[PDB]
């Protein structure tokens, strides 16, 4: 299967756009509203269709295009929810379009072709004949689809012959127009059907005698009477030509709006008329305005003539290269249609009188097609041409709606219409054709183009709005599988299309638009619920699971680094031998530092064997959940059963979360009684966990002396948090006290920034820097710099220099002494502090100097009531 | 601090509801719309407010009540997004209410109290309104700036004025019933003349023993002589009557003014039911008939009258100083609503039944001698209602001017919206500083319209937006079972709040659809902006933060509730085994998982890497990228976990039991087959396989062991001829039947024939068929003989080493003679032994059982599978 762009995309879209709306209701629309407002309407109705076509192309290019049709692409590229929603609005639009074309064919048959074989009598004739035609067309569609697909070329040929004849007639009008006298009464419009000739008196047998017009206007058959209406005798009777040759005075004439009312009379603005009363037996003698005309009504009546851009991408499977052949073809069809309407609007407006355009049924002329009056060969070619075009459009719509319904039914998206997929032995639908025919009858029972057209418009506008909105949303949030290759495509275009087509959908009828939107929302949510129930198993719980998975998948792609740094903690609790939380203050501290917003996972390892201790794990999980609910901290809880607690801690540290929902901080407690007991396990386990959390580039929070930390009911009134930032990790060391004081427990503790990084430098510049940095934070904490020394900070400087370059025992003995001098300073100037935060030095590289490192950490925090040590990970930015 | 229900909630709400609409625009509404439609209007405007009061009570009952005010409760109980959105609509409503009350005070000053002080003296009335409203707005802002304390002291007086006014109205009516007042209104045929100009309504009067033309004649006929015939035909053709304007209460008037009489702009107020002979008229007479001022309809009347019943959120405004709020707020608010509704109903009926249908339609009381139309019936004098309404309007304006900037200051100090942080810079006392100025500017921009009949709909739009948002939030949070939302109200049900949302939305669209669209877009923009700011504050990114927050919210909500699903769908964990060069050994497992899930569900891909964590981080990260790429190729959407353990066996276990977050857990482990276990000299592989098998059966997980993974098809291949074989032996029938269906759901197995072979036979077949009806597979069922002795191994393991092999070899014989040419064979395997040493024999069994079959997949049930 391989065919080019032309015979695969261009000709079908053109054949679907040229409909009956042009002939039957273009001239009337142009004359009633003028040339300006008509051109503006055409432009407004082409822009929405252009933005929808661009979005449709952006959809049709990303990835491969499914070979099924025009509904499979939408579904595959926008999800089952959207695809299901789009298919149904399109189905309803198609069945009402078939109905409307049947109405057009009936109207053209009973009014101009042959009126003998026929207020509300006309409506009843329309109903009866439309029902008969619908029956016959449904039967034909049942038996003879092959012949329709055979004869489909003829309908386009007829349309082209008709348009060629119209333009040829115009070009012949410019230099030699036809003759079609329309009769006048002052500034009124007479129906030429009854009268033989329009003249008050005629000369018969050497003398004047009253004409049929007289006898119809005056009840007296003798001229010598004075009991007639004043308007007839007061004004004249003229015979102006109806087809004035092309000129700039006529296009100047019919240039301003002429919106009439229901029942008014078609009047020729620009003739002398002296008003007077009139009888009530004369109204059947003037031409009358049939329906109330406005701007929104004309929008609604014209819109079904620019629809069908989804009909071009309808033989997608039998295409050579669809990605490059569908969009260009569709847009070329749009451009051709827009230019044909513009040129025809201007030619009609500028070539025909402003009073004969308003005869919806061609009353001024002797019951002819008003647009058929200007046609070179004869007015009989356009009538037959439009008749065959209407029949063909009806047949093709009745062929193409049931196929869409059958596809949607066999896709098993909406469950209650599975039966509509019981196709024939060949695949042709059976109980979808019946539903379509019944809805078409329900539409025919209205029997008026001016009321069927807005419903059709609502369905199509809803479909287009949905396509555009889906495209824009999927582009904004970076949907995982959505990458279009179109060059001139940008989500701003789809947004503008949504706005314009929404404005149209609301101009026609706000309440109808609300009903359509509610139907669409109901079907969308119902599809979503059914999909959730089918993938997972539950309705409500299934919805939540699906939302979670969607969010995680979308978060997967993209740069995995955030411009800011906020602590997301993982609290490593240590369960007792009796399965009790040893330090229930860690949970309290986590709740005070997070305040219930963010991610907080709470892991714990249970020594033993997994094969025989599963119930223990479940019990411990419930226990931790209860204890965690009490302290009011909202988080998940993981429990693993390892053989040795060390490897359990490792597996917990490096594997907790799903993709992007990872922790970036490990808060572990302090080992108490490590030197007291003879078992040296404690400090080696602690140091091993420290080394394992520093090699994964994670932050570290080691709250020392956890038994003295406040509870949530406690409150502090006087006190000041103390920060003792030594060299590095300034960002997190400044971000912690702020997030802490944001809680009511530390609601008003004064912050004091103590800095010890003299390094033979000046504090004046560092004070200005700290203050300006604090200005953005707005903490405004007092900054004081203590007189620091290089030899005093030697322990930290060694590591700092090594870190800068990257960007033992001799040193350790010195480190202990520096640790004790620093401890002396801090305990003499910050003893009475409420909470003290200072950054700790990194663990040694040598696996044996760990005891000295522990002695350093113990002699450093000697005397301080409450001290929290934080170690940076190195990837923190702010 | 402790004060009761009455003086803490009831009276403030009453003071906020009874407003100026009642006096200035009730009679006009009743006369224009009739009695019936008036009752309907009152009912419609009371129902939306009643449902909103019920939802507000449900909010005020869950948990403890914040002591701050009326905005803190909403925030704490509905989240920062909703609470922030509500605050702005309520703020705008309050400032426009200040504007409307000022307009009411100006209108009452220029029309009844003193008409000479009309400086401008059409558009002159509008310009006078503009100037005087500006002067008052300035003066009231300054007063509110300096003297809040005296306002808080004198606030009771305004309520005293309102109550005395209403009591006087009813006293006047009751006096009307048996002895009415006198207020003659003059008539011309069936029109209504303005009684201000004429001295007396009579065509001719007798002066000095003779008749002379009266002032009415000179106004209608410009000639001062009776002997003239150059006047309009309407004056001479019709009569001049003087009907009483206040007929005492009776059933004849309520019978008259009972149907709607919507006029048009410029029409004439006509008394239906009087003799009138029509005739043309001049154009210099229009200044002498009373005229309808604006076009009247039904929707217009709803829009103008809705502000009267607003203010139910002002009752829960001294929340901190309350004795027991949970039992005192709802009952107080609802009693205030009921009292207001009954007062309106009784007053509507009283007006309908006491006043003529022609004097109700003079919006400014022209038929009567420029009096307050409602003041005609009042016992002491019509002077009590005028002064009463003046003081009431000034007091309500003052309190709105006091209560709006305070709310803005609260929102600014809550630090939700960042660009209005400056508005929290209160004075030394707490009185707002740059919030009062902004409020005064908005009030001026509202005054520039200078017409109650045009300001009222804007006020209504904002208040309706607030109520709709409250109701919708309550209903949704009750439906989705948010974790921290449990209301204690007795008569509360999410259907009621939903119905309230529907009704108040209907109102919002009846009044003016376009305004409703603008309000909804403002609300949506602020809602999404608050959500974005919350994301920026918790996580760090705007978009990535939004996604993280959505994920966390979904997981937390899914946490609570029954942890068992009615259905069972496989959620796989594919255990890949990386090579020494960090390449996927069997990339066909990922293909098989993608075929079994079809891209919908959860699929985690774990793998263990032997070594030490301290020195092997980069290898793990590189392997993570490798697995992600290989998984992207096969088109399977899933997450990837890699852990670095010491001994692989141990790492596996930890991978099996800890993967996921809370409720997003796996329930099926698909591991490959150990190849070369007996051929390999070392016995390390089977020792690992058996350990993973034993560990995954003790966690109650299903098990899928695809054997011979090197012959499984890829995605590009297609099958035309073949038949899947299922060999369900004893147990695990549900999942053994659900697997082939989910498999054939993919295009690769799109049309492979399914054959069910099952080791009373009619009863069993009937059961399989009835079960198959729901599934709809309709696959052919073939039941081979069932020997208990042959299957003894499965029965004995569920509920002799030499015998094991004999049964396995007979079963292998049967399967290979009746299913050798099968495409895919699925059969359930027996459980591994409890003894840790018979693993070699167990492996020999498993090897000799599936001997000859090209492709065989073995499934073992977990035991908690339902379908
Ligand atoms: C066709 O002829 C009739 C009668 O001559 C035109 O009637 C229009 O409307 C009324 C009579 O129905 C007259 O207009 C009056 O004009 C004054 C001056 O502004 C205005 O104050 C009145 O309210 C009324 O509009 C007059 O006969 C004529 N007026 C206009 C502006 O057309 C009718 O318009 C004619 N139709 C055409 C010319 O298309
Ligand atoms: C006050 O008197 C005026 C003038 O008489 C009333 O206006 C006109 O009243 C007459 C008599 O009711 C109406 O005539 C009726 O017209 C309708 C069709 O419009 C016809 O079906 C009836 O059989 C009858 O002929 C006339 O329409 C009406 N309006 C005008 C412009 O003449 C006025 O209605 C009286 N007040 C009230 C409250 O009725
Ligand atoms: N079983 C465990 N599970 C999780 N973490 C542990 C465990 N044991 C120790 N830790 C980590 O080390 C700390 C305690 O270590 P250790 O048991 O050596 O001293 P403890 O005072 O006896 O308790 C805990 O706060 C935690 O950080
Ligand atoms: N290092 C590993 N990482 C992940 N999974 C493994 C690992 N080793 C074994 N497995 C799992 O157990 C199965 C048996 O692997 P084993 O190493 O015992 O056999 P092998 O293929 O002969 O080597 C593998 O198919 C895999 O499912
Ligand atoms: C009617 O036509 C006659 C014939 O020319 C003309 O004289 C007369 O003025 C016309 N009347 C009007 C009202 O134009
Ligand atoms: C005016 O009133 C007199 C008083 O009886 C009455 O006779 C006359 O008919 C009235 N005029 C009309 C037009 O009814």
Author numbering:
A (entry chain A): 116 to 233, 244 to 932, 1011 to 1081
B (entry chain B): 116 to 236, 244 to 881, 887 to 926, 1014 to 1081
What does the paper say about this structure?
Potassium‐coupled chloride transporters (KCCs) play crucial roles in regulating cell volume and intracellular chloride concentration. They are characteristically inhibited under isotonic conditions via phospho‐regulatory sites located within the cytoplasmic termini. Here, we present cryo‐EM structures of human KCC3b and KCC1, revealing structural determinants for phospho‐regulation in both N‐ and C‐termini.
To gain further insights into the structure KCCs in an activated, non‐phosphorylated state, we took advantage of an N‐terminally deleted variant of the closely related KCC1 transporter (KCC1Δ19) with deleted N‐terminal OSR‐1‐binding motif H/RFXV (residues 3‐6 in full‐length KCC1 (Austin et␣al, 2014)). Interestingly, 3D classification of the KCC1Δ19 dataset yielded two conformations that differ mainly in the degree of the counter‐clockwise CTD twist and the inter‐subunit distances between the central TM11/12 helices. Helix α8 moves from a position close to the central β‐sheet to a position further away from the TM region, over a distance of 30.6 Å (Cα–Cα distance of T926 in state 1 and state 2), by undergoing a 47° rotation around the β7 strand.
